[PDB]
């Protein structure tokens, strides 16, 4: 009931570069009545340094069907990272004061990605 998220991953191994295209979400669930339908996506590689392991898309405005159409790139990602790490993808709505309400997430173990082979996803969000 939470929403569907479309995204694409490509590990450009020769350039130590993980490109995460956050495409669109469909049907994100209305939550807080005092919240805003201003969705963004947060990426977190786990486990990880904090800071350096987080990337965020643009925040869009007044939509339950956002199209970010945005590529976030983690540089310096090696085969050791690909073996050890999980990409967590969380969709949040920004509120009136800049804080946020979590809608849902998905995770992908980077082990399962083949170097240089783009993988496309259309998943339903879950709360963990």
Curated annotation (Swiss-Prot):
Domain of life per record: Eukaryota
Gene from which this protein is expressed: Rph3a
Function according to Swiss-Prot or TrEMBL: Plays an essential role in docking and fusion steps of regulated exocytosis. At the presynaptic level, RPH3A is recruited by RAB3A to the synaptic vesicle membrane in a GTP-dependent manner where it modulates synaptic vesicle trafficking and calcium-triggered neurotransmitter release. In the post-synaptic compartment, forms a ternary complex with GRIN2A and DLG4 and regulates NMDA receptor stability. Also plays a role in the exocytosis of arginine vasopressin hormone.
Domain notes: Binds calcium via the C2 domains. The calcium-bound C2 domains mediate interactions with phospholipid bilayers.
Boundaries of the shown chain within the full protein: 382 to 509 of 684
Binding site for Ca(2+) 2: 32, 38, 93-95
Transmembrane segments: none
Residue ranges constituting the C2 domain according to the UniProt record: 1-123
Compartments reported by the entry: Cytoplasmic vesicle, Secretory vesicle, Synaptic vesicle membrane; Cell projection, Dendritic spine; Postsynaptic cell membrane; Membrane
Subunit structure: Interacts with RAB3B, RAB3C, RAB3D, RAB8A, RAB27A and RAB27B. Interacts with RAB3A; this interaction recruits RPH3A to synaptic vesicules. Interacts (via C2B domain) with SNAP25. Interacts with deubiquitinating enzyme CAND1; this interaction results in the deubiquitination of RPH3A. Interacts with GRIN2A and DLG4; this ternary complex regulates NMDA receptor composition at postsynaptic membranes. Interacts with SNCA.
Residue sites binding Ca(2+) 1 per the record: 31-32, 93, 95, 101
PTM characteristics: Ubiquitinated. Deubiquitinated by CAND1 to prevent its degradation.
Disulfide bonds: none
Designated name of the protein: Rabphilin-3A
Taxonomic source organism: Rattus norvegicus (Rat)
Tissue specificity annotation: Specifically expressed in brain.
């Amino acid at each position: 009931t939470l929403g569907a998220l479309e995204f694409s991953l490509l590990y450009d191994q020769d350039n130590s570069n993980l490109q995460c295209t956050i495409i669109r979400a469909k049907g994100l669930k209305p939550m807080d009545s005092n919240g805003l339908a201003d969705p963004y996506v947060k990426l977190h590689l786990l486990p990880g340094a904090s800071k350096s392991n987080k990337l965020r898309t643009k925040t869009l405005r007044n939509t339950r069907n956002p199209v970010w159409n945005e590529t976030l790139q983690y540089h310096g990602i090696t085969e050791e990272d690909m073996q050890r790490k999980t990409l967590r993808i969380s969709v949040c709505d920004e509120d009136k004061f800049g804080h946020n309400e979590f809608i849902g997430e998905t995770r992908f173990s980077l082990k399962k990605l083949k170097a240089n082979q783009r993988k496309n996803f259309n998943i339903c969000l879950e709360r963990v």
